[PDB]
Amino acid sequence: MADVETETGMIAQWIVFAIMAAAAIAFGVAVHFRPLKSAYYINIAICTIAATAYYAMAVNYQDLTMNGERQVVYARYIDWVLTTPLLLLDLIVMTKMGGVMISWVIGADIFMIVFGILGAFEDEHKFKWVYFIAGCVMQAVLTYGMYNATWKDDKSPEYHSSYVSLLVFLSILWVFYPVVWAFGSGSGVLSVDNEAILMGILDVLAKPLFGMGCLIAHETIFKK
């Protein structure tokens, strides 16, 4: 039979919705009482984006577009394509990284997503996986560069530290997405719902939580 999202998946998403929404509102207000405002904006956008994406996924878990006999909840790629770049930025600001380099990490990132999307809608397993590799290779490149701003002597010693910190956290976490993907969206061995929940779990770690980390860090440092 076909693997399609259910009330369950819906639930999960709906839950994520609320969280995102709150963070959005939270930061959304907070910002008006700071100096520094930018860092806030970044994360406001991020969560507002997600919130929206999840909101769509949730209300339409029934309107199924399918690759094979398994529904693909693509809205997430959109989210990701927009959010992921903003997440890297959240860290980039803690560094003195050069525009030229920024564009590279970002560009890499964007493709990482698209490849995923490409694979997500591919029939031939033969290609599906090729695409998968691609993205991983992008996540790779991308990650590599992010670390050059670690050892290569280029902001303040406080920042540098916080940066390193958050990065290792983001760096590791992210590799989970591709793993989960590979499993469901990619292989099929994973349910649409479970994938949703898993992805969902990740998102909340990757976005709201990370956000706080950053905001704090900034707020913290700024106080020095």
Ligand X SMILES: *C/C=C(C)/C=C/C=C(C)/C=C/C1=C(C)CCCC1(C)C
Ligand Y SMILES: CC(C)CCC[C@@H](C)[C@H]1CC[C@H]2[C@@H]3CC=C4C[C@@H](O)CC[C@]4(C)[C@H]3CC[C@]12C
Q: Is 173 in the site for ligand Y (CB under 6 A)?
A: no
Q: Which residue is nearest to ligand X (CB)?
A: 116
Judge residue 40's burial from the number of C-beta atoms within 10 Å of its C-beta, 0-12 exposed, 13-18 middle, 19 or more buried. Answer: buried
Q: How many CB atoms lie within 10 A of CB 98?
A: 11
Q: Is 80 in the site for ligand X (CB under 6 A)?
A: yes
Q: How many CB atoms lie within 10 A of CB 197?
A: 19
Minimum gap (Å) between residue 16 Cβ and ligand X: 11
Q: Is 83 in the site for ligand X (CB under 6 A)?
A: yes
Q: Which is nearer to ligand Y, 29 or 140 (CB)?
A: 29
Close Cβ partners of 163 (under 8 Å, ≥ 6 residues apart): 91, 94, 95, 149, 150, 155
Q: Is 219 in the site for ligand Y (CB under 6 A)?
A: yes
Q: Is 221 in the site for ligand Y (CB under 6 A)?
A: no
Q: Which is nearer to ligand X, 140 or 216 (CB)?
A: 140
Q: How many CB atoms lie within 10 A of CB 10?
A: 18
Q: How far from each other are the two terminal CA atoms of the chain, in whole angstroms? A: 60
Q: Is 198 in the site for ligand Y (CB under 6 A)?
A: no
Considering only residues 27-46, where is the footprint of ligand Y by CB under 6 A? 29-30, 33
Rounded-to-integer distance, Cα 138 and Cα 149, Å? 18
List residues near ligand X by CB under 6 A: 80, 83-84, 87, 112-113, 115-116, 119, 132, 135-136, 139, 174, 177-178, 181, 203, 206-207
